[PDB]
Write a protein that binds this ligand. Structure first.
Ligand SMILES: CCSCCNC(=O)CCNC(=O)[C@H](O)C(C)(C)COP(=O)(O)OP(=O)(O)OC[C@H]1O[C@@H](n2cnc3c(N)ncnc32)[C@H](O)[C@@H]1OP(=O)(O)O
Ligand SMILES: N[C@@H](Cc1c[nH]c[nH+]1)C(=O)O
Ligand SMILES: [Cl-]
Length: 329
């Protein structure tokens, strides 16, 4: 005998999101990522993206879940982002149903897509190891500071570090995306093999294969880049413009994401400093969650630099960002 389908008194309805559901989406998003949720600041942007479909699950006419799918890598990849289920609806399989609906939508709307990708920091287990390939991983360093405090004290801390011989920042080199420097870096086969994690660009949790088509997407975001040497690149860093996050409930917090590629810890330190000096003046009067993604064996060095050297507070211990990939059949 076959298993008969279970009747549902309150079946889920899956619909494409519009601006009118923003407040309902906020209402299901309390506490996400400990206050580092980007969706409040990004939801309206998402609605404009040409290769993105933002799907809502509704029950009894009310939004209870959300997932975004976005086609990238010149049509070969769908990136899954933002997956969330209202707290009062969790533990019932809702996320599983929403993911299945979105997979069906991708198969119908984007028949050329070959794989799905996503990033996560949750501990991976045997199940994850069978559904996904691990493309790469980075360590995650999360620190917090008041920008006015950093602005007032940073110069004097650097002076003390320099005069004691403990730390002076090494020279770094300018990278102009408009001038073609980013393309020259990211399209280099040697950069791809030796600098980028698993040959991939990760920008504020979003993975991109290094290709002309993806560089266009990166170039519209207003990123800031730095490198140790354009001629012989070994450490490349990427700062995403800071954006408001709900942490703290008061509107005073911003999220500053820096992705660091390569293995020279001293250059990661110098480039981190460079980005903080670039970004802090516009953050005056605000509080900052700064999250640095870097090769795992550099985490302790950079955590010490941030805390003891720069006077920033460590928010949590070591965690990892996993880039996961599954085939679409
Ligand atoms: C791309 C974005 S990354 C970020 C993820 N987003 C967040 O951080 C936002 C906050 N978070 C949430 O919004 C919810 O917490 C989420 C995670 C969305 C879950 O939403 P939810 O609706 O509660 O999820 P459920 O479908 O019930 O989760 C079942 C899945 O956990 C495993 N699992 C373990 N124990 C189980 C059990 N007893 N029964 C069934 N599955 C079980 C299983 O592996 C399955 O997955 P699968 O095998 O794919 O079915
Ligand atoms: N896959 C997650 C990645 C993430 C961003 N911030 C924290 N985690 C998402 O799209 O929401
Ligand atoms: Cl030094």
């Amino acid at each position: 005998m076959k298993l008969e389908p279970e009747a549902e008194a309150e079946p889920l309805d899956f619909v494409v999101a519009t601006e009118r559901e923003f407040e309902e989406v906020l209402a299901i998003s309390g506490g996400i990522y400990g206050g580092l949720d980007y969706l409040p600041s990004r939801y309206h942007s998402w609605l404009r993206d040409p290769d993105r479909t933002v799907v809502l699950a509704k029950r009894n006419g009310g939004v209870i879940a959300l997932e975004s799918v976005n086609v990238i890598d010149a049509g070969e990849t769908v990136l899954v982002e933002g997956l969330r289920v209202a707290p009062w609806e969790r533990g019932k399989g809702v996320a599983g149903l929403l993911q299945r609906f979105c997979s069906q939508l991708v198969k119908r709307q984007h028949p050329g897509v070959k794989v799905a990708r996503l990033t996560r920091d949750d501990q991976l287990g045997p199940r994850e190891l069978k559904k996904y390939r691990l493309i790469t991983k980075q360590g995650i360093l999360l620190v917090r500071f008041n920008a006015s405090a950093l602005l007032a004290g940073l110069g004097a801390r650097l002076a003390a570090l320099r005069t004691s011989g403990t730390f002076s920042p090494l020279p770094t080199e300018a990278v102009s995306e408009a001038g073609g420097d980013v393309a020259r870096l990211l399209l280099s086969p040697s950069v791809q093999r030796d600098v980028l994690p698993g040959g991939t660009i990760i920008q504020d949790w979003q993975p991109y294969r290094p290709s002309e088509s993806n560089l266009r997407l990166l170039a519209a975001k207003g990123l800031e880049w730095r490198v140790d040497s354009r001629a012989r690149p070994r450490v490349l860093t990427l700062c995403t413009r800071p954006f408001p996050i709900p942490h703290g409930g008061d509107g005073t917090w911003r999220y500053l994401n820096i992705d660091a590629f390569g293995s020279d810890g001293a250059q990661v330190q110098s480039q981190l400093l460079w980005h903080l000096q670039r970004q802090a003046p516009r953050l005056v009067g605000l509080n900052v969650m700064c999250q640095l993604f870097l090769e795992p064996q550099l985490w302790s060095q950079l955590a010490d630099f941030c805390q003891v050297g720069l006077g920033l507070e460590l928010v949590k211990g070591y965690t990892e960002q996993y880039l996961l990939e599954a085939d679409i059949h």
